[model samples]
Target chain A: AMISHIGTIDVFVNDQDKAIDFYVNTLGFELREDQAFGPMRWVEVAPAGSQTRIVLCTKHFPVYEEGKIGRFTDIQLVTEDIKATHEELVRRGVNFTRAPEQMPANASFQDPDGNEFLLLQPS
Target chain B: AMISHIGTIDVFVNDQDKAIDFYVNTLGFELREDQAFGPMRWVEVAPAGSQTRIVLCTKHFPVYEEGKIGRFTDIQLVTEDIKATHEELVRRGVNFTRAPEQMPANASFQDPDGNEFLLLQPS
Candidate 1:
């Protein structure tokens, strides 16, 4: 074995504060780490006690652009109750592109920035 | 308080088999799941015993296009020894954009598909 495990997933955002609010407040991920590192602010958030975190990066560098902010459909979040979680998140002002639709296993939704994520029931 | 944890991260690729090989043989991730669902293949791989998985998706639908195959930069992998792991990956024919550079805590490299990822030493 060469690689170990997932440490973090970079979710690029236009506004760091707004992204933080959406993830922490709307999505209910715990704000794990928030520290200023050099010119850019390094931030990390995740579900409580999750080993892997989603690092919020701003469009300050050339690599992070407005066009690329909401296009990443990589990260998927799992929930025990998709319907209830969807309803609660929508009530909390989270913008979901679609109502939780059924699948062979689960459903999916989108964050405020349109980054799509799956909400899978525990297997 | 709401969402539980990360289930998976979608890593879009033009070729599923090639992506699988790169992740498994080159990066040393264990092939966790490989099943056919409807019109597409649902493939998942991860570091040994990792709960979270990287779902390899091919350009099979409208949402998956050739232009977007390699542009995602939303996932990070952690290693105990960055330099040794980096060297091992290189020897395994993994294409890293740059040699591991210094950071306060970590460095980064890119996958063959141009998806950038951070390589953080255990903190």
Candidate 2:
């Protein structure tokens, strides 16, 4: 079957408070929480007009071990101004895996967690 | 904060029946249905031991338009035999956006929906 683009990506973080702070305060992500599921909440954030969303979840998943390094996967995000956005992120303590690299005219960075996401300059 | 790998991906198809056939029957994916969701069901399938799951869902999302062509994204799937698997997919009436292309020793194919997923062969 043709599996479509990821609609939602769930991140497993050890602390819910720190995760929320990083996503909401540090990265300026809007949080959407699912509170009906008891003690843990399902928090999701997305870039405007994008179909894909990233979720911040607590480390309660049985398969996930605490404090383990995560693997790499690419997620697309639109950035009309790459240098300005990168500067803002750098100022906010978002650890890019590596400094920005160029592909064509686009700029990309790997997050501290090791996932590479790209910033596509507006046309 | 630290966004993690996609633990799951949800696909929206036009018809639930056709979707199930594509994922469970044609793709040889084992079905795992979540029955608690009432009228609308959640059916997930994945490769053996993989944390990432692909869900087959009917067209009920408000943002999704009917009969529309989709965009591109990448997903990773492991394959032992690229040619044999590609042949099998072709035989099953699954459409590939393009034929197999080589990247070093790895091969990738784009699905009809325009999303390209790669097949990582064993070492």
Candidate 3:
């Protein structure tokens, strides 16, 4: 087929350090990589023990800009218990523009860079 | 932790049918969902047997537009054999902005909507 599955997703950030804190400390992702590559730094993080890593990138990279950072409604994370996850995240100081409201079970939240994510508990 | 791993990613497209054709017929991802919810249609596709699905959204949705479509360097797919995968995709008429080049083994390609993806074979 297409050889294999998805490995990384570029999550555009204004500041890598701030984004790292938001993802690792706030969102509970494990810091996977933080290494310099040429003029740009390559940083990646993921949910603990997840195969797909989110490569926290910057507008410094080619074909990227500051405006494009938060405009995307890109990543969606699944929860076994939506209310529980929402409560825990709120307690941790994670910003949620839309709280855990549900018909099919979904909550919308934002990262440090304004990149939004949908916290879903599929019904 | 947060919840579970990534459940879905929003892959913005101009045309759902064209994007579906590229993702399904060319890239070999299976159609996961194609149901309408209110004014917008909820469409998702993923690599066969993959847990993380890509939701092919359009500018018609909230907080999205045509300008944002191609600017995203999101979504990286991993492959066992880079050369084989690249060759096969090229044979299938997939466009690659950059050919299978070496650094950590990657080939950059685009979908019908011009959203870029890196086909990586991490060493």
C-alpha lDDT of all candidate models, in order: 0.76, 0.53, 0.83
TM-score of 2: 0.44
The DockQ for candidate 3, computed on C-alphas, is 0.66
Model 3 off-target regions past 4 Å? none
Of the candidates numbered 1 and 3, which has the greater TM-score value? 3
What tens digits encode model 2's per-residue C-alpha lDDT throughout B93-118?
Answer: 76665555564234555444533545
2 or 3, greater by DockQ: 3
**Could you tally the backbone clashes for each prediction?**
0, 1, 0
lDDT of 1 by residue, B1-123 (tens): 567899888777768888888888878899998988778788998998787888887777445656666674556787888888988877877666656766544666667777667677766
Q: For this target, which candidate reaches the highest TM-score against the unseen true structure?
A: 3
DockQ values, each candidate: 0.72, 0.04, 0.66
Candidate 1 docks with a DockQ of 0.72
Extract clashing residue pairs from model 3. Answer: none
Q: How high is the lDDT of residue A68 in model 3?
A: 65
lDDT tens digits by residue: candidate 3, B1-123:
656799888878889988889889888889999998988899999888887888888888775655768754567898888898899999998889888888759888988667888888888
- Order of candidate numbers by TM-score, starting with the best: 3, 1, 2
